[PDB]
């Protein structure tokens, strides 16, 4: 019947745990659609994926696709307003983003479930009638240039483009996808090109319905969603565009057996080994490429990483297939190098080929296939319920590769065992088809080439035929053995019956001097999983720079020691996180509950009886040193955030103090440290998931007893449970701290307007105001003024204190950036005074939905509780309490709030600014003097010379009082 629909797919295979309804289909114009009905979702979502990307960029206008992506948000014939789309989402608790890859342009958004249509309608016009306004084009081109600017000094982007440049230049794979002002404005202007028209042509030529896939999720029934989509998208024209293909691999003969030496920005040592392979996408039912990735990248006993690590040459390894594009792929084996490893690259590669030989000798193993297959089935069946926005985005993308009925299982369920495909791929992993790249500062001054788009310095040499021969003649190494059955594979998935004393929030079931235990049996997700979070309190983890370094090294050495054993647990869906904090240690164990007690016991036992391998100590210590120094290569805005942190926190060691004390840590010193650190402790945990109260108390007591038995751990005094405070800025004061980033040629800035201590009223005043200025800030500071790609605003919360913050990374100097933000602040005051009571009440409603949005999965809900515990506020019913209060606020309250704490002449303005200057900028003032709003005059700021003196001269805020929670 329905002429608008070409076909309605059959039942969409889903997990029996998934309560959501699905319906796949294809419109007459060829758009592949997947509809999802979730009557409980608080936010609805939609996404569209055009199977065309930067690889299709015209040779003379690199980045056009990406620019097209940006421009579609800037207005359509149906909705002309520059930010009609953004403003609509923001006002209805929604959000949106989009990305461009070589073959895809993915657009997505989410919004309050009762406004899907309004949002979808505006969204559909992007693919129907974009305006590509001339004024918007001249401006938006800066955001793109700004985006590329931040990547220029990023080692990942540099290496990503270098591989493209080192392949065949004729192949479209060598194209520069990001684009910048030069390629999108300057250059095209020197060639009489009207970018407006090119955008119109590109959109008209490639944005064809036959190359699109859409996924929508909402509370509406499947029929309602169907009529909705048919009504908004069936009008997209089908121009029958052939799907681009690239059967000829970018790496041909002349590109093989090549060695590349690259100079990195950060001080890192890496070895990259690549093999050109066919496109294995079509073989998703067997995944031969992953089979080899599973083995070659395996950690655990007998693996390649094991030998490479025991020889002290490598620390980490990554192997497997890497995506290329329709027609080609690569198989990689990358590894970080130690100092010794750098001098043994040839030997490392030999081991790689020896292990590969072992695989050819043993032949394809079906039990290995069955194992991964069983794990993937368990993973799919008990997959966590995803958030709409990311879910619609993913589906829209994969609808292009799999049948409607299999779009959910395609990436999980394995069906075919293909020893013939496995051998076929293995036959490509040979010395004569290899590419090797080494990244090291040791190449500095020895290179003779430069990548044009990023300026990467490197050298290219052919691999000497004898080195190739030696690799080709690799024999079996007895140290290399296939993995054995994975004993961590779960088998018990029974969901315990919801106990009688089951509470809505975590309950305190143990309150002793040694430990405080918060517990909650899962009452809504019903999956065989659990979250076990432990907070270990010890003053010796952050007493001084030296101990902080040891706290770090200790845990880093420990994780390096359990790795081999822990890897199996990882593959079996059981992982953990262990790291040092300013208060001691943090341990988290999550995944299937079945075998968690086994991994946990093992970690704590190893923790309290650890024995440091000297060789491992020197290697990891050297890396840590580089890690600290490498902070100099981080982005300007990251530096700004870092400085503000050091400035506002009572106690904080800088990275300079850390590396300085790093030469004082010796093996003897570290060995003494550990027992000291564990001697006296206090543990606060949160056990949440498929577990009983008795299992929880049991797990908590097992941890303590293990520590008590091996480390003689004793309880910590209550007064020893210190919490750091935040510096209390003086009324009407303004301080400025200035620094310089010596790597990036961009400026960074962060402005913090401290308000007051956290509390129900103070929190919502700050949050309502942020909700109201959020979209206007982005639209004003970026879209119109184009200060930079990174323009952020929102609340800052720390040590129980809070306030409004602004973060911007730009080419413009900080003193100018500040002037603009001050100008924006005044624009908002007028804006709030001019908005209707309904518009105001609308933002309240939008903030309410954002705050009440339910977690979809166990770990998400656990995170919320963990936050209440970590901050020691324990306000588990915060969302309902705070929203109720918010619904009470008036426009007058917000106006008074701003006038009292935010305005330039505010009686209680507490302002601190962090100015990060660009590389090529010696000095720069701290203050200074079109169609831009007028910036108010600013007072003379006090320049912070020394951080320590700054804090000493200021008072400290008190800590927030805990919310009441009773139980024995």
């Amino acid at each position: 019947n329905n002429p608008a629909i070409k076909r309605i797919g059959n039942h969409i295979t889903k997990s029996p745990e998934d309560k959501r309804e699905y319906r796949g289909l294809e419109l007459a114009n060829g758009i592949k659609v997947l509809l999802i009905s979730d009557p409980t979702t608080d936010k609805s979502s939609a996404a569209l994926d055009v199977h065309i990307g930067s690889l299709s960029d015209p040779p003379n206008i690199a980045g056009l696709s990406h620019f097209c992506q940006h421009m579609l948000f800037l207005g359509t014939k149906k909705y002309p307003k520059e930010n009609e789309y953004s403003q609509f989402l923001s006002e209805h608790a929604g959000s949106s983003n989009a990305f461009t890859s070589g073959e895809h342009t993915n657009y997505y958004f989410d919004v309050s479930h009762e406004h899907l249509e309004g949002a979808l309608d505006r969204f559909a016009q992007f693919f129907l009638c974009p305006l590509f306004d001339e004024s918007c084009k001249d401006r938006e081109v800066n955001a793109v240039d700004s985006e590329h600017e931040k990547n220029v000094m990023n080692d990942a982007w540099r290496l990503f483009q270098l591989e493209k440049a080192t392949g065949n230049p004729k192949h479209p794979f060598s194209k520069f996808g990001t684009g910048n002002k030069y390629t999108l404005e300057t250059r095209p202007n020197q060639e009489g090109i009207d970018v407006r028209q090119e955008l119109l042509k590109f959109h008209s030529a490639y944005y064809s319905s036959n190359l699109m896939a859409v996924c929508v999720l909402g509370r509406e029934s499947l029929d309602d969603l169907t009529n909705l989509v048919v009504k908004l998208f069936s009008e997209v024209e089908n121009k029958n565009v052939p799907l681009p293909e690239f059967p000829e691999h970018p790496f041909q003969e002349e590109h093989l057996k090549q060695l590349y030496k690259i100079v990195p920005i950060k001080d890192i040592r890496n070895l990259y080994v690549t093999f050109p392979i066919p496109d294995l996408q079509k073989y998703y039912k067997s995944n031969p490429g992953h089979y080899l990735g599973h083995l070659i990248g395996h950690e655990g006993p007998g693996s390649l990483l094991s030998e490479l690590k025991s020889k002290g040459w490598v620390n980490t390894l990554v192997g497997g297939q890497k995506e290329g594009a329709r027609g080609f792929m690569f198989f990689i084996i990358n590894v970080d190098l130690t100092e010794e490893g750098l001098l043994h690259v040839e030997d490392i590669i030999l081991h790689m080929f020896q292990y590969i030989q072992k695989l050819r000798a043993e032949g394809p193993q079906e039990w290995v296939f069955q194992e991964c297959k069983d794990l993937n089935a368990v993973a799919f069946r008990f997959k966590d319920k995803e958030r709409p926005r990311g879910y619609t985005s993913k589906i829209a993308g994969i609808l292009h590769y799999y049948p409607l009925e299999e779009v959910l299982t395609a990436e999980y369920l394995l069906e075919e065992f293909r020893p013939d495909l496995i051998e076929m791929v293995l036959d490509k992993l040979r010395p004569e088809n290899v590419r090797v790249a080494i990244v090291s500062k040791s190449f500095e001054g020895k290179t003779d080439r430069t990548e044009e788009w990023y300026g990467t310095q490197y050298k290219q040499e052919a691999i000497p035929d004898e080195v190739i021969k030696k690799w080709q003649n690799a024999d079996l190494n007895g140290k290399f053995k296939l993995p054995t059955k994975n004993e961590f594979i779960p088998t018990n998935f029974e969901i315990l019956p919801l106990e009688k004393e089951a509470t809505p929030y975590p309950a305190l079931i143990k309150d002793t001097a040694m430990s405080k235990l918060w517990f909650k049996q899962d009452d809504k997700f019903f999956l065989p999983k659990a979250c076990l979070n432990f907070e270990f309190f010890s003053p010796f983890a952050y007493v001084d720079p030296l101990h902080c370094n040891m706290a770090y090294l200790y845990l880093e050495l420990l994780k390096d020691s359990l790795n081999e054993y822990a890897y199996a647990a990882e593959l079996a869906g059981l992982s953990y996180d262990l790291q040092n904090t300013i208060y001691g240690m943090y341990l988290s164990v999550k995944g299937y509950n079945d075998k968690q007690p086994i991994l946990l016991k093992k970690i704590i036992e190893k923790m309290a009886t650890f024995e440091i391998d000297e060789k491992r100590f020197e290697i990891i210590k050297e890396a840590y040193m580089r890690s600290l120094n490498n902070f100099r290569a981080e982005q300007p805005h990251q530096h700004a955030m870092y400085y503000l942190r050091l400035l506002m926190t009572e106690v904080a060691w800088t990275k300079d103090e850390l590396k300085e004390a790093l030469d004082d840590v010796t093996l003897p010193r570290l060995k003494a440290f550990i027992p000291q650190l564990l001697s006296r402790l206090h543990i606060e945990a949160l056990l949440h998931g498929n577990i009983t109260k008795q299992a929880a108390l049991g797990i908590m007591q097992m941890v303590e007893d293990t520590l008590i038995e091996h480390a003689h751990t004793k309880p910590l005094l209550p007064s020893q449970l210190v919490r750091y405070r935040e510096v209390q800025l003086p009324d009407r004061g303004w301080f400025v701290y200035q620094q310089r980033n010596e790597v990036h040629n961009n400026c960074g800035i962060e402005i913090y307007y401290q308000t007051d201590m956290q509390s129900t009223s103070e929190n919502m005043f700050l949050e309502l105001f942020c909700q109201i200025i959020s979209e206007p800030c982005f639209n004003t500071l970026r879209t119109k003024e184009q200060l930079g790609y990174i323009v952020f605003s929102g609340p800052r919360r720390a040590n129980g204190i809070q306030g409004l913050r602004f973060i911007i990374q730009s080419e413009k100097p900080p003193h100018y950036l500040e002037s603009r933000v001050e100008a924006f602040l005044i624009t908002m005051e007028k804006s709030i005074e001019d908005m209707t009571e309904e518009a105001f009440q609308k933002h309240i409603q939008a903030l309410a939905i954002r705050r009440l949005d339910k977690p979809k999965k166990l770990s998400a809900e656990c995170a919320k509780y963990w936050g209440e515990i970590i901050s020691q506020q324990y306000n588990f019913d915060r969302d309902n309490t705070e929203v109720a209060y918010l619904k009470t606020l008036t426009k007058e309250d917000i106006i008074k709030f701003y006038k009292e704490m935010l305005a330039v002449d505010a009686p209680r303005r507490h302002k601190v600014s962090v100015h990060v200057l660009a590389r090529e900028m010696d000095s720069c003032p701290v203050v200074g003097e079109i169609n831009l709003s007028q910036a108010p005059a600013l007072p003379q700021p006090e320049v912070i010379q020394n951080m320590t003196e700054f804090k000493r001269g200021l008072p400290l805020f008190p800590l927030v009082k805990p919310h009441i929670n009773f139980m024995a």
Binding site: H70, S101, A156, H290, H294, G297, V318, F792
Partner: peptide, 18 residues
Amino acid sequence: KCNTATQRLANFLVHSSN
């Protein structure tokens, strides 16, 4: 580890709020 478990690099409209 398996690459399958890894940061493909694409260009996003907006930076991450996280």
